[PDB]
Amino acid sequence: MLDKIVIANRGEIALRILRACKELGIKTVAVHSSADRDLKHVLLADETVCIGPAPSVKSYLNIPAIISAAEITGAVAIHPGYGFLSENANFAEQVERSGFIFIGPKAETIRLMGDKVSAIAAMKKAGVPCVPGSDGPLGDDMDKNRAIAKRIGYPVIIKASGGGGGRGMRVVRGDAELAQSISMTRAEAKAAFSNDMVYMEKYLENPRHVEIQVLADGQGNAIYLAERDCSMQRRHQKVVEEAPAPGITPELRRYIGERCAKACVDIGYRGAGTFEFLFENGEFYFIEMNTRIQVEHPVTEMITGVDLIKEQLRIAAGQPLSIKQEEVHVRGHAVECRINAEDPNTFLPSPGKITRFHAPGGFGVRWESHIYAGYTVPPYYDSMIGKLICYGENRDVAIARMKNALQELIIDGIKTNVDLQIRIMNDENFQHGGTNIHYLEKKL
Amino acid sequence: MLDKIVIANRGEIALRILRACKELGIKTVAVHSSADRDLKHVLLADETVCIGPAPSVKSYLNIPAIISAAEITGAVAIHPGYGFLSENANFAEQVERSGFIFIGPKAETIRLMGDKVSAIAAMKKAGVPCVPGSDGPLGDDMDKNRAIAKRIGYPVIIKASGGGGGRGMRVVRGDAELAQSISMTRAEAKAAFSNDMVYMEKYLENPRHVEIQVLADGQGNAIYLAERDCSMQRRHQKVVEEAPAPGITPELRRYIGERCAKACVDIGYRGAGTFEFLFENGEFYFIEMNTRIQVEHPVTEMITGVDLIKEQLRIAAGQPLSIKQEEVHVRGHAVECRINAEDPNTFLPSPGKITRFHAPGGFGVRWESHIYAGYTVPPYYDSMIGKLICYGENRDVAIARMKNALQELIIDGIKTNVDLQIRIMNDENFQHGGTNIHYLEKKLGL
Ligand SMILES: Nc1ncnc2c1ncn2[C@@H]1O[C@H](COP(=O)(O)OP(=O)(O)O)[C@@H](O)[C@H]1O
Ligand SMILES: Nc1ncnc2c1ncn2[C@@H]1O[C@H](COP(=O)(O)OP(=O)(O)O)[C@@H](O)[C@H]1O
Ligand SMILES: Nc1ncnc2c1ncn2[C@@H]1O[C@H](COP(=O)(O)OP(=O)(O)O)[C@@H](O)[C@H]1O
Ligand SMILES: Nc1ncnc2c1ncn2[C@@H]1O[C@H](COP(=O)(O)OP(=O)(O)O)[C@@H](O)[C@H]1O
Ligand SMILES: [Ca+2]
Ligand SMILES: [Ca+2]
Ligand SMILES: [Ca+2]
Ligand SMILES: [Ca+2]
Ligand SMILES: [Cl-]
Ligand SMILES: [Cl-]
Ligand SMILES: [Cl-]
Incomplete structure (x- = not known):
């Protein structure tokens, strides 16, 4: 059995993982942002490492901080939970x-x-x-996008390839809304996931x-x-x-x-x-x-x-x-x-x-x-x-x-x-x- | 069939009973003492009836008040939980x-x-x-009580017939402690259970x-x-x-x-x-x-x-x-x-x-x-x-x-x-x- 693990997450899932660890006698390392010092599982963990300030980009998505936390504590494994990395x-x-x-x-x-x-x-x-769809990433050619929409049949949905939690998804009912929907979804997906790849799927x-x-x-x-x-x-x-x-x-x-x-x-x-x-x-x-x-x-x-x-x-x-x-x-x-x-x-x-x-x-x-x-x-x-x-x-x-x-x-x-x-x-x-x-x- | 019941108890068990009633669509009447107005199940109950002041003997053991509560609310059944009545x-x-x-x-x-x-x-x-024991209540004859302890063999235990929660029980290692152990368990049982009947059991x-x-x-x-x-x-x-x-x-x-x-x-x-x-x-x-x-x-x-x-x-x-x-x-x-x-x-x-x-x-x-x-x-x-x-x-x-x-x-x-x-x-x-x-x-x- 794993000797010690870093729980590379927060909130309810980090506590869920901590409990399972404890039952199996696995030592726990809680990595946390400076905003999460008082998380229930941080307070229950055997070891804790602060991995950065509050924004996720600086902490829970901070790959080298998390991997370094495993090295400094002598952990052998990392549980990513859900979301994040x-x-x-x-x-x-x-x-x-x-x-x-x-x-x-x-x-x-x-x-x-x-x-x-x-x-x-x-x-x-x-x-x-x-589900019938673009079967690949959408490019910038609006004629081609309209043609895919016509083939599968309105309505359609523009979906982020790296999307999660329902973010980076937009329903399109017809040609008139297609361009601004593809453009908006790309922008949302680039912001939330650092990945602007979208595809089309039949709604x-x-x-x-x-x-x-x-x-x-x-x-x-x-x-x-x-x-x-x-x-x-x-x-x-x-x-x-x-x-x-x-x-x-x-x-x-x-x-x-x-x-x-x-x-x-x-x-x-x-x-x-x-x-x-x-x-x-x-x-x-x-x-x-x-x-x-x-x-x-x-x-x-x-x-x-x-x-x-x-x-x-x-x-x-x-x-x-x-x-x-x-x-x-x-x-x-x-x-x-x-x-x-x-x-x-x-x-x-x-x-x-x-x-x-x-x-x-x-x-x-x-x-x-x-x-x-x-x-x-x-x-x-x-x-x-x-x-x-x-x-x-x-x-x-x-x-x-x-x-x-x-x-x-x-x-x-x-x-x-x-x-x-x-x-x-x-x-x-x-x-x-x-x-x-x-x-x-x-x-x- | 049971559309309303009185929960004739308090604390964790009262809440336990209430939850089962809520899940089954059974209306609840929480009877409580004046010290128990803020009990969780009391607050969650459909109806509440105060059955007496703080002491148990004046509230949760108050038979007339508990039955009156059932009568006045139109309850059909009473759950006594554990302990009490x-x-x-x-x-x-x-x-x-x-x-x-x-x-x-x-x-x-x-x-x-x-x-x-x-x-x-x-x-x-x-x-x-x-367990080998007196097979009947203990009387006041100590020659007979000692004879029982001989038959079964020390250590023995004096137990209240109306006893609960470990109360009204005393272990007896020999003849020298027997009589006072009996007297004291009788007294303890009388005060706690309104029943001085005690028996003897092999320990x-x-x-x-x-x-x-x-x-x-x-x-x-x-x-x-x-x-x-x-x-x-x-x-x-x-x-x-x-x-x-x-x-x-x-x-x-x-x-x-x-x-x-x-x-x-x-x-x-x-x-x-x-x-x-x-x-x-x-x-x-x-x-x-x-x-x-x-x-x-x-x-x-x-x-x-x-x-x-x-x-x-x-x-x-x-x-x-x-x-x-x-x-x-x-x-x-x-x-x-x-x-x-x-x-x-x-x-x-x-x-x-x-x-x-x-x-x-x-x-x-x-x-x-x-x-x-x-x-x-x-x-x-x-x-x-x-x-x-x-x-x-x-x-x-x-x-x-x-x-x-x-x-x-x-x-x-x-x-x-x-x-x-x-x-x-x-x-x-x-x-x-x-x-x-x-x-x-x-x-x-x-
Ligand atoms: N690929 C991803 N990138 C970033 N965050 C994600 C990703 N997938 C899911 N999440 C996030 O993880 C959390 C749980 O995801 P959710 O879709 O709500 O549950 P699940 O998919 O486990 O049913 C949400 O906060 C969600 O935004
Ligand atoms: N092609 C579709 N047609 C209709 N509804 C959809 C379609 N794709 C997704 N959805 C709805 O949106 C939800 C989220 O889509 P999903 O692809 O699971 O994205 P995420 O990665 O954000 O969880 C789905 O659970 C489903 O209910
Ligand atoms: N015959 C009784 N008379 C009065 N109170 C009792 C009686 N039996 C048990 N109790 C009380 O009920 C509560 C629960 O009893 P306990 O012996 O601890 O649990 P159980 O017998 O259910 O394992 C305790 O407060 C105890 O003193
Ligand atoms: N004859 C005995 N010998 C040894 N231990 C006993 C004997 N009788 C009872 N005990 C111990 O005392 C505890 C309480 O006795 P019990 O008769 O169950 O009284 P109560 O009505 O208070 O629950 C038992 O659970 C047991 O562990
Ligand atoms: Ca996913
Ligand atoms: Ca999903
Ligand atoms: Ca009993
Ligand atoms: Ca018992
Ligand atoms: Cl939170
Ligand atoms: Cl209490
Ligand atoms: Cl309660």
């Missing part, structure tokens, strides 16, 4: 070349599957259905977002761990996730899961990852592979019993897969509500001091957050401050449980989306299940 | 006589099995091995405390839900509980579980309950049946997936058991640490205002408590303020989770036993498993 092939490469284990896929796999244009190309090559009218969790050891064994439905979204970012996906039958589950496990073996995938699909009229269409842990991984944990972070760590230690496919069993249902520090109605950021906090508790309730009363939410990072996950023997119980937990959850001093999450749980169509990716913004 | 046959009778459902066994069953002298007699009648030197969770519908169906080891103890009261019990083999689990389920059917048991045993040399010896929910019920919930409170309510509504025996599956391991507002060294109660509170979290971490920052723990009640329960795929993972969760738990402003629980989890002998009921006080030097 986790899908950055350059970082993965540099980690390995400095003598450290990168807790994730090989750098070449991150280039293959992390970049969204080449992932689509790879999946098409593999015989995995994708699907009625799909659900359904994704399959995979685990592969890099030795040729791969498994799938059921699926998740993450169709409740705002600004193309997930708000609620659940597992398993409602209406997905065992026959269909195994069909898509086997395809994902096979895809892992073929490309030589290593570690945890997720294949994300649009599910429409009984068919799955590949949109993205996250070559990293998923934010919403706890719902899969609840319904399978598998600890996905521990599996990541075991795999990084060069352990083969312990779990066989036949040993994976879906039991019950879990729902996750993201908790974000933003106005529940205007959706504008609400950083600042949390004056009162109370987490919910009870049978089947899991709270995933670094926040505490007295803690200051900084302005510099993403608004997601916590995750509430409720498990039940069935979906009705899980939702009932969530409804009650959200009523017990207190976060005062800043604005949150807790009241929005309450509204979603009370929604007749969410209760029905199988609402499409456009539903939440329709409702709102 | 949960094992009070007179209360159960009166609740039933007044036209309400008592969420628990029939009153006759409470007097048969709640009373500890009759429970032993009943179990002996049914051919279940008990077992190397047993473990292993208990079997049961559920029965009162319609003839009865099941056991594996077992719990509760051997970490101070002053004869549980400090740490875990499930399943280490080193209990499948043949032993079914042997004892089947006996307990049969006993339920035979006495017409209804609801949740626990048969408590001393386990030594591969043999079980019955000591107590709790005719009510256990404090440590969550460890069994985590390894079986069964919601025990919801089952109590279902049974109380007249529904048959939701599960057959062949459907009970044990998966993983769970450990519970009780959290008490007390000096971690001397164990003197530590009431007062909680100035800072932070609860642990994560995969497999379950925190069961009403406490919050700004909350004042009153001097009037039992010191237990919360329970931390950690589940894992195996015992090692559960313990490792508990270590981590204990490091996260912040309760400032009052003394707690958090530091004790940390020491227990770090104990190598505990980590191996199977330590006996005397181990913790041995470790501490008590």
